[PDB]
Design an enzyme around this catalytic site. Structure first.
Site, short mmCIF file in Angstrom:
data_model
loop_
_atom_site.label_atom_id
_atom_site.label_comp_id
_atom_site.label_asym_id
_atom_site.label_seq_id
_atom_site.Cartn_x
_atom_site.Cartn_y
_atom_site.Cartn_z
N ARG A 172 0.84 -1.19 0.00
CA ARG A 172 0.00 0.00 0.00
C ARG A 172 0.88 1.25 0.00
NH1 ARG A 172 -3.08 2.95 4.64
NH2 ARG A 172 -4.18 4.43 3.30
N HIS A 223 -3.59 10.77 0.62
CA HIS A 223 -3.01 10.61 1.94
C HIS A 223 -2.48 11.95 2.44
CE1 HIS A 223 -1.48 7.19 4.71
NE2 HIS A 223 -1.24 8.34 5.33
N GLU A 235 -7.91 8.03 6.23
CA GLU A 235 -8.27 8.55 7.54
C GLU A 235 -8.95 9.90 7.41
OE1 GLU A 235 -5.18 6.25 10.41
OE2 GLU A 235 -4.78 8.31 10.03
N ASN A 280 -7.79 1.28 9.47
CA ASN A 280 -6.53 1.57 10.12
C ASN A 280 -6.77 1.47 11.64
OD1 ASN A 280 -5.74 2.20 7.51
ND2 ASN A 280 -5.22 4.33 7.95
N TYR A 321 -4.79 1.52 15.54
CA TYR A 321 -3.58 1.60 16.38
C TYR A 321 -3.91 1.28 17.83
CZ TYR A 321 -1.26 3.40 12.28
OH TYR A 321 -0.60 3.46 11.09
N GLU A 329 -3.74 -0.42 7.83
CA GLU A 329 -2.61 0.03 8.63
C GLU A 329 -2.72 -0.53 10.04
OE1 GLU A 329 -2.24 4.54 6.77
OE2 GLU A 329 -2.02 4.23 9.00
#
Length: 429
Positions: free
Chosen positions: A73, A117, A162, A283, A285, A337
């Site tokens: 990606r 992005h 995002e 994504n 985290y 991600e």
């Protein structure tokens, strides 16, 4: 315990890795503007050079090939394609991504392209940026350009990375480019990013694109206490962070209250936004703590990365299950991600022993397998990042790579995590 044929990948973004900011006719982006301002970047750096992937991409493709990932990606830099965000494409910009994609295909790698992005051409920001509905249309034209060039060869597309970060951090509190701080005046940005997404999906399909999805940040949202103000805060944050971006794409509606706060023909726009997708990319985290109209803080009781972020793999399982509960028709999920900041570099023998990154990635792959075992259809995982790179307002201080980058010499050194991941991927085949 991952599905047969599960896809392993690695992820990057254009401004964070490419450098060559003034080469080959590239236009200024909002990140060029932001990083030129004193005090915006904690170490006073920029993406002027960063990893210098614009000149060193063969080496990086060879790293992906040696890693044995199924997918890569990357993002396309809109300023390389349309320096001002409108008008005929810059041929040198087209050529760069044309050649990169052909090389990935020769290496047997499935290219995943992110159109946006965060590197909006400055000329569009000067006219209002994502506050202008017209920026959605300019984005659709750019999507058509890149679909016309690459549509037969790219395996997966992610229109907007995002959009929640772009909205809340870029335009809401101004911690990221372009640095506007409109609070709820940033809601139109969310609408226009979503409209841009939908129009881009149509442009890509028209151009012959293969699979189209998303790459939206999601996180379980935890109230830091029992206070109504705190549970209400946490609910609102969840509504603004997760539902605002997932509900229009997957259900063709906004969370309660939000449509009435959006400009333009909102009902018609929601038809455009809710184009059918091949996958849903997310994504992840960590979970997000919320209190008291809200304030975010770290959920306690977890170990933290070098960025101060909680290490909470069970949060990924929880999210995946909850997304499937909220959106029963959700398409196959790709984790577009996941990764962690840990700052170790080459020791005296040239070895980067980043065991904490291994622990983090291992636990998160386990969390994915735990969701699969509950019936969540997840089909791949892309590690953020292949390379240590420019981490936005934190500059070079937060290293996410499987591969260490020395910013002075530009030498790449595969870390222990690189070898670990390569072995995981091989074992699963």
């Amino acid at each position: 315990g991952l599905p047969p044929g599960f896809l392993f990948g690695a992820s990057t973004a254009s401004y964070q890795i490419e450098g060559a900011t003034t080469e080959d006719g590239r236009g200024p982006s909002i990140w060029d503007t932001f990083t030129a301002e004193p005090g915006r970047v904690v170490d006073g750096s920029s993406g002027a050079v960063t990893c210098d992937h614009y000149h060193r991409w063969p080496e990086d493709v060879a790293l992906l090939r040696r890693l044995g990932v199924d997918g890569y990606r990357f993002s396309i830099a809109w300023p390389r394609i349309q320096p001002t965000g409108s008008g005929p494409a810059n041929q040198a910009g087209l050529d760069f991504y044309d050649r990169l994609v052909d090389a990935l295909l020769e290496a047997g790698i499935a290219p995943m392209a992110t159109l946006y992005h965060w590197d909006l051409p400055q000329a569009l920001e000067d006219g209002g940026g994502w506050l202008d509905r017209g920026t959605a249309s300019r984005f659709a034209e750019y999507a058509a350009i890149m679909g016309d060039l690459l549509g037969d060869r790219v395996a997966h597309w992610c229109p907007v990375n995002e959009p929640n970060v772009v909205t809340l951090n870029g335009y809401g509190e101004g911690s990221l480019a372009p640095g506007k701080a409109l609070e709820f005046g940033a809601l139109p940005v969310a609408h226009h990013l979503l409209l841009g997404h939908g129009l881009a999906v149509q442009a890509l399909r028209a151009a012959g694109a293969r699979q189209v999805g998303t790459a939206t940040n999601h996180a379980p949202v935890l109230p830091l206490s029992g206070s109504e103000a705190d549970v209400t805060a946490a609910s609102l944050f969840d509504a603004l962070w997760n539902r605002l971006f997932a509900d229009p794409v997957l259900l063709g509606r906004y969370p309660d209250g939000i449509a009435d706060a959006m400009p333009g023909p909102v009902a018609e726009d929601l038809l455009t936004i809710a184009q059918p997708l091949d996958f849903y990319g997310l994504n992840y985290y960590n979970p997000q703590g919320v209190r008291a109209p809200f304030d975010v803080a770290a959920v306690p009781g977890y170990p933290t990365t070098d960025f101060g972020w909680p290490v909470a793999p069970s949060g990924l399982t929880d999210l995946l299950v909850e997304m499937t509960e909220r959106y029963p028709q959700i398409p196959p999920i790709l984790i577009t991600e996941n990764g962690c900041s840990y700052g170790m570099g080459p020791d005296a023998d040239g070895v980067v022993d980043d065991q904490p990154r291994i622990d983090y990635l291992d636990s998160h792959l386990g969390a994915v397998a735990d969701a699969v075992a509950r019936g969540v259809d997840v089909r791949g995982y892309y590690c953020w990042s292949l390379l240590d790179n420019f981490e936005w307002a934190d500059g070079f201080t937060q290293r996410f790579g499987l591969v260490h980058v020395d910013y002075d010499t530009l030498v790449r050194t595969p870390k222990r995590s690189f070898d670990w991941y390569a072995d995981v991927i091989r074992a699963h085949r």
